[PDB]
From a paper:
[name] has been suggested to adopt two conformational states that regulate its functions: a GTP-bound, closed conformation, and a calcium-bound, crosslinking-active open conformation. The primary function of [name] is to cross link proteins via the formation of amide bonds between glutamine residues and primary amine groups. Using SAXS and cryo-EM, we show that guanine nucleotides bind and stabilize a monomeric closed conformation while calcium binds to an open state that can form higher order oligomers.
To confirm that the structure of [name] bound to guanine nucleotide is in fact a closed state monomer, we used cryo-EM to solve a 3.2 Å structure of [name] bound to GDP. The cryo-EM structure of GDP-bound [name] is in excellent agreement with the crystal structure with an overall RMSD of 0.8 Å; [name] adopts the monomeric closed state and the cryo-EM map displays strong density for the nucleotide binding site and the bound GDP molecule. Importantly, due to the stabilizing interactions with Arg580 in wildtype [name], GTP is able to bind to the closed state [name] monomer by achieving a high-affinity interaction that can overcome the flexibility of the β-barrel domains. The SAXS experiments were carried out at 25 µM [name] to achieve a sufficient scattering signal, while the cryo-EM analysis was carried out using 3 µM [name] as was necessary to obtain an appropriate particle density, which made it possible to capture the monomeric form of the [name] open state.
Numbering used by the authors: 4 to 687
Write the structure that this text describes.
């Protein structure tokens, strides 16, 4: 019979065509909705359509079934593609045949395996061509994750090194991150992740069938990052007691987290955080083919049970009583994927927000799920998934009540805190920051904003607030350099033409990005502050390194809160600010000419800003397109104040194009300090 000796998958051509060149190392990895090539090597009889009939059968999942789309059998139609799964002969030479297979744009995602059934006469021999991986295609016009443009496809599906935005609203810091979705073994890790969710354990066949929908895959991926408690990827922790594992700030790449999760069976990786969850989810989604970007919202009202009215009761000193209340997060990071939604009303296609951080649900504290960004913009809270929570995270209202010792309460005019004021992501192509707050909220004070609030029953906050002549804000003169003492001003501007005798309550506390305040690092209690008519007074507060050294969080955030209170019945004024203390810059240099499969040396240096010595200095670099594993060096000698630490590392780049070298510094006193540098690998 027509027996075959070997089947030659064209790894190079398929990888180049389907943009899966990095993934096509040893196994074929193609994208649905596109024709991929294949080669058959028959020894002597070659192939004749007259008597030889080939019918491919492709199998997926532990419970295949034709009606569910997992299993598909299709003949060798030489003329055209008459259906979803088709195979046509494109070239026929001596001893060899070529094939151009095609997959439906709505095929399930996962590990498929082929089977040739060569039926010549009565001899229907059954073969096994091999396995391959099917991923979401952003290039197929009929696919649900199709992107019209090309730069967006490169940035969101093929770029494996990006920026996570942190710090404060007034000072955005672009911390580098190495997604590495195309790293060695990452795709298998993502498949195992998709093969261990509770839905798969409940009904494997239904899960495999429903993997075709990108929204379901997004839900499964986001829910298995942290939300799953049994064998989730990470284990959240917020108190600064990460000694049992790796601190959240220490992570520089999701590849390490995924490899640690896979190696230790499936146990939770130690002490991740919200932006870590977003980075891991973005890595998994990008590996699976879904165009995903990490989006950070500053002053987010996360974990408020979707409440649109947040009331904070404070004391006469401005300190928030009632510890049961949840603080306003300085920033919250969630992913945003590109999908088309048939399950919703027409027009709700495009960017969909996934939040892998479990909020406080009324049932079980689950994740959020894909809500259209346009749905949040128009306030369509009635969508399928958790629209109200994401809407509250960007459109909440905060009321700061002051409860004095007399038992009475007053409303403080807090004009500084705006929920969801700055939403940022990485720009397409360049390294700049793209401020996408306009796609989540309508412009303030506009008719569209009013109608969106009316559709969301949220028009309560639109009402005008107090308009007293007193005005006040927290001002910063120079850059916030960590490890040095500084002064932060409280600016009072008066235009009422009325002399005021008020008392001011400066207080600075080390705070994490969750809003968990720590011990005070400086205070100032002015009791007879005088404000002249049409005057403008700046009251400085001195913050000392010896004060915030002990309790500073690893995110280098300090909250300065000041309260201007008049003894008379008139209301109270409040002003808060978040200061990001800048870590010292990591100077990265590359010596030699960057060439593929050639030795490279990276000269990394840092200058210690602290007045004391760092003991356990440790550099760690990672790059998806530069190295196959993290390069870690430990300096065995402490570096004194002002002294400069300097190390050299060896790299063996293996991929072309542009790459980012993510560098992390970890010492006993200077915490995780990040750095990056773009390198272009030469053709050689
Ligand atoms: N590192 C750091 N720099 C800051 C921060 N806030 C402000 N700055 C610096 O202050 C400058 C802007 O000053 P600005 O805040 O507008 O002054 P203000 O309007 O009087 O409060 C920028 O160049 C920043 O470098 C912060 O939290 N961290």
């Amino acid at each position: 019979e027509l027996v075959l000796e070997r089947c030659d998958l064209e790894l190079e051509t398929n990888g180049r065509d389907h943009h899966t060149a990095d993934l096509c190392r040893e196994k074929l990895v193609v994208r649905r909705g596109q024709p991929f090539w294949l080669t058959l090597h028959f020894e002597g009889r070659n192939y004749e359509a007259s008597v030889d009939s080939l019918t491919f059968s492709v199998v997926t999942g532990p419970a295949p079934s034709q009606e569910a789309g997992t299993k598909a059998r299709f003949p060798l139609r030489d003329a055209v593609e008459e259906g979803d799964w088709t195979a046509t002969v494109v070239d026929q030479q001596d001893c060899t045949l070529s094939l151009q297979l095609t997959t439906p744009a709505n095929a399930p995602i996962g590990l498929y395996r082929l089977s040739l059934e060569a039926s010549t006469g009565y001899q229907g021999s059954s073969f096994v061509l091999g396995h391959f991986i099917l991923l979401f295609n952003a290039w197929c016009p009929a696919d649900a994750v199709y992107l019209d443009s090309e730069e967006e496809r490169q940035e969101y599906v093929l770029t494996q090194q990006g920026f996570i935005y942190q710090g404060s609203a007034k000072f955005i810091k672009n911390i580098p991150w190495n997604f590495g979705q195309f790293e060695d073994g990452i795709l298998d890790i993502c498949l195992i992740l998709l093969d261990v969710n509770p839905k798969f354990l409940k009904n494997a066949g239904r899960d495999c069938s429903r993997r075709s929908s990108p929204v379901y895959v997004g839900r499964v991926v986001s829910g298995m990052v942290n939300c799953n408690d049994d064998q989730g990827v990470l284990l959240g922790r917020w108190d600064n007691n990460y000694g049992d594992g790796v601190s959240p700030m220490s992570w520089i790449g999701s590849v390490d987290i995924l490899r640690r999760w896979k190696n230790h069976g499936c146990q939770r990786v130690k002490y991740g955080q919200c932006w870590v969850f977003a980075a891991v989810a973005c890595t998994v989604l990008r590996c699976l083919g879904i165009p995903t970007r990490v989006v950070t919202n500053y002053n987010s009202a996360h974990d408020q049970n979707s409440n649109l009215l947040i009331e904070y009761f404070r004391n006469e000193f401005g300190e928030i009583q009632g510890d049961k209340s949840e603080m306003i997060w300085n920033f919250h990071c969630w992913v945003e994927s590109w999908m088309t939604r048939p399950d919703l009303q027409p027009g709700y296609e495009g960017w969909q927000a996934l939040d892998p951080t479990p909020q406080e649900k009324s049932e079980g504290t689950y994740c959020c799920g894909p809500v259209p960004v346009r749905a949040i913009k128009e306030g369509d809270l009635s969508t399928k998934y958790d629209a109200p929570f994401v809407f509250a995270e960007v459109n909440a209202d905060v009321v700061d009540w002051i409860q004095q010792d007399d038992g009475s309460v007053h409303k403080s005019i807090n004009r500084s805190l705006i929920v969801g004021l700055k939403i940022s992501t990485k720009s397409v192509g360049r390294d700049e920051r793209e401020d996408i707050t306009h796609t989540y909220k309508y412009p303030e004070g506009s008719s569209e904003e009013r109608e969106a609030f009316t559709r969301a029953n949220h028009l309560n906050k639109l009402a005008e607030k107090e308009e007293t002549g007193m005005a006040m804000r927290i001002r910063v003169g120079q850059s916030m350099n960590m490890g040095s003492d500084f002064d932060v001003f409280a600016h009072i501007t008066n235009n009422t033409a009325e002399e005021y005798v008020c008392r001011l309550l400066l207080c600075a506390r080390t705070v994490s990005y969750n809003g968990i305040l720590g011990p005070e690092c400086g205070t100032k209690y002015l009791l007879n502050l005088n404000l002249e008519p049409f005057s403008e007074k700046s009251v400085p507060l001195c913050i000392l390194y010896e004060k915030y050294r002990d309790c500073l969080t690893e995110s280098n955030l300090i909250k300065v809160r000041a309260l201007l209170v008049e003894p008379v019945i008139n209301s109270y004024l409040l002003a808060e600010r978040d200061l990001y203390l800048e870590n010292p810059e990591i100077k990265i240099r590359i010596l030699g000419e960057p060439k593929q499969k050639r030795k490279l040396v990276a000269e990394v240096s840092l200058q210690n800003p602290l007045p004391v010595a760092l003991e356990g200095c440790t550099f760690t670099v990672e790059g998806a397109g530069l190295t196959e594993e993290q390069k870690t060096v430990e300096i065995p000698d402490p570096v004194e104040a002002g002294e400069e630490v300097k190390v050299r590392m060896d790299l063996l780049p293996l991929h072309m194009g542009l790459h980012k070298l993510v560098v992390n510094f970890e010492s006993d006193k200077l915490k995780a300090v990040k750095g990056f540098r773009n390198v272009i690998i030469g053709p050689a």
